[PDB]
Amino acid sequence: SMSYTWTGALITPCAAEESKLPINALSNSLLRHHNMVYATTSRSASLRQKKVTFDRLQVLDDHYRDVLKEMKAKASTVKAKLLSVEEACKLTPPHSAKSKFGYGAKDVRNLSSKAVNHIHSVWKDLLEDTVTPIDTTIMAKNEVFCVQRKPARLIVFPDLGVRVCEKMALYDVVSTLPQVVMGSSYGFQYSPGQRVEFLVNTWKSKKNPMGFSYDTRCFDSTVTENDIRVEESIYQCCDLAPEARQAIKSLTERLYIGGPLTNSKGQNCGYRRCRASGVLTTSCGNTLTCYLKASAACRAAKLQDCTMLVNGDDLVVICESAGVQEDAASLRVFTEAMTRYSAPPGDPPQPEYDLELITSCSSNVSVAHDASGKRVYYLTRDPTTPLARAAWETARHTPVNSWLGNIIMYAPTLWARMILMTHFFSILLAQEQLEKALDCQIYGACYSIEPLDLPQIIERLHGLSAFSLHSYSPGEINRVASCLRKLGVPPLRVWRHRARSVRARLLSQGGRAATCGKYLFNWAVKTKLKLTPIPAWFVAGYSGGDIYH
Ligand SMILES: CC(C)C[C@@]1(C(=O)O)C[C@H](C(=O)O)[C@H](c2nccs2)N1C(=O)c1ccc(C(C)(C)C)cc1
Numbered sequence: 106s107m108s109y110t111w112t113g114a115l116i117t118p119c120a121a122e123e124s125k126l127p128i129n130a131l132s133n134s135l136l137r138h139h140n141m142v143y144a145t146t147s148r149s150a151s152l153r154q155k156k157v158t159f160d161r162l163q164v165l166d167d168h169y170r171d172v173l174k175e176m177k178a179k180a181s182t183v184k185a186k187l188l189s190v191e192e193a194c195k196l197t198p199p200h201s202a203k204s205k206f207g208y209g210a211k212d213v214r215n216l217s218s219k220a221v222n223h224i225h226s227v228w229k230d231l232l233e234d235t236v237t238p239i240d241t242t243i244m245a246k247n248e249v250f251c252v253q254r255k256p257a258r259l260i261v262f263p264d265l266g267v268r269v270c271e272k273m274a275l276y277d278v279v280s281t282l283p284q285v286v287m288g289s290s291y292g293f294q295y296s297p298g299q300r301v302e303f304l305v306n307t308w309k310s311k312k313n314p315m316g317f318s319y320d321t322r323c324f325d326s327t328v329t330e331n332d333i334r335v336e337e338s339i340y341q342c343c344d345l346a347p348e349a350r351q352a353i354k355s356l357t358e359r360l361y362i363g364g365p366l367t368n369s370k371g372q373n374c375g376y377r378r379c380r381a382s383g384v385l386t387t388s389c390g391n392t393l394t395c396y397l398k399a400s401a402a403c404r405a406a407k408l409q410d411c412t413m414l415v416n417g418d419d420l421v422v423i424c425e426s427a428g429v430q431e432d433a434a435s436l437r438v439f440t441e442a443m444t445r446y447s448a449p450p451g452d453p454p455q456p457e458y459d460l461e462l463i464t465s466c467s468s469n470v471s472v473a474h475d476a477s478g479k480r481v482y483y484l485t486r487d488p489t490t491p492l493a494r495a496a497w498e499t500a501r502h503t504p505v506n507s508w509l510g511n512i513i514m515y516a517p518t519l520w521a522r523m524i525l526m527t528h529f530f531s532i533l534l535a536q537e538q539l540e541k542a543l544d545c546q547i548y549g550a551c552y553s554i555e556p557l558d559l560p561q562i563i564e565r566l567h568g569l570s571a572f573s574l575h576s577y578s579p580g581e582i583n584r585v586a587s588c589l590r591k592l593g594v595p596p597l598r599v600w601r602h603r604a605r606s607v608r609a610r611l612l613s614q615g616g617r618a619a620t621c622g623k624y625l626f627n628w629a630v631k632t633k634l635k636l637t638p639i640p641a642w643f644v645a646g647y648s649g650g651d652i653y654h
Contacts, residue, residue: 106161108159114372114375116151117368119244122144124144135595136592143250143252161447163329163446176286176393180339181343181344188273190225193272197272197651202242208265213265226266244260263360271360275385281645283392286396292466294645297516305470315425317422317457318454319399326380329447332394334357336390361381364376400413401442407438416646419467421463469485469486470484471578475570484517488588495511513562516567534610539555550653551654560625607629
């Protein structure tokens, strides 16, 4: 079973594509080494096609079926409802790709008779026909990185009308089923504060902790027809309306399992027999399947008191050490089992005995201290990709503002606070756009957020301590500092100076602006203001699922 077959028609862009970092008058103030930042384009799609295209073999044993039965028993306790057309329309992002059939995302949200009538017709066809593959578009993503070049990632998605029907049939299921089935292991239920707390508590719950990340090579491609049918059998355990059962069976047979791929010019590029990246069930499906395969590999490997944390294809296991030699051997058996289940590693997993050395959701635990000097754990990452993207967004308006998502999700970090907040608040001040709502993504869902709302968002997701962290670790400081030399970003001392300016400017404006100056930039003044609570999201993952929050 090959993950894809190809005709030889090219994956085509739908618009002009920039690969070189755009530069304006603000660029050099953030980043000098411009030639290190690039965006992927369709020109590299051929290279990605080669990576994602392979044969899958699967060998399924008793541990696999044992975990599956347990998951199904939990899933049987879920009661889910159909969403009305209206409800599903309201979940559609304002800038979601328009339909081939003469209406767009705004027509959908506005419940135009054209959009609604077509959606009813798509729904009825799902009920009537559980056989015919549904068309999908394949595109090369344009994403920004620092050199050391990756090929474009590919996205596969059905028409807007289908996307709305998906929401009707499955939004409630994908929202509620995974936490029921996986409990505390379900990663999307945690804000960053809750996630770091769960990781630390999980780590402290072991007599002698051992943990590891497992990186599956090209997870979407490893997903087989079996996996997707197993997923459907899980959804079908829920207490559902008969009409929902039928639409889910239909979406599975006609879309989820596979189908034809069409380029932006309407030419046939080939055929998919693996996970589509751009459907509603991508995140929930990947999470279930990763959790199933890994729970079964843990038993194969005889790992003791395994605690998993799963976000799609992102997987972390923390368990009881059996000793160093025993743990390394167990990890090999875990990997052999994952491989048989069709999920071979990209890089071999490594046992860790220090929590801060485990990377999960591209992040690691680290520690700083609050106002009182008490230890605070928080999640951070190498800032290289966030800063390359910030540089891009400095000179170019983009559909999604990663700088804003990074400020929200990495608010307690040295680099988000000193660089991202300082840089973008300065830019927003200059343009008097503090009040302008901007689109960003959190766990792949789309939010419209005004920068002026940041103080309360951060306090909720991270705690008040986020505004007073200091004495960061030498390792964390060292990683940030070396990233800045690599990219030609000004040293942290320059950012401190800039932040004092930005801060003073914000305070003057009173109201919300002054709240941003006071809370976001307290780290920048030598005699700190006493920071006190302020007056005036994490249920499930929907990456690729076209969800507006
Ligand atoms: C600008 C980003 C903040 C947006 C992004 C997204 O999924 O839409 C993409 C980000 C990415 O790494 O691709 C990050 C995610 N990491 C792992 C899964 S999702 N993203 C997160 O939303 C995200 C950041 C940080 C975190 C933790 C710090 C690990 C809580 C979870 C999720």
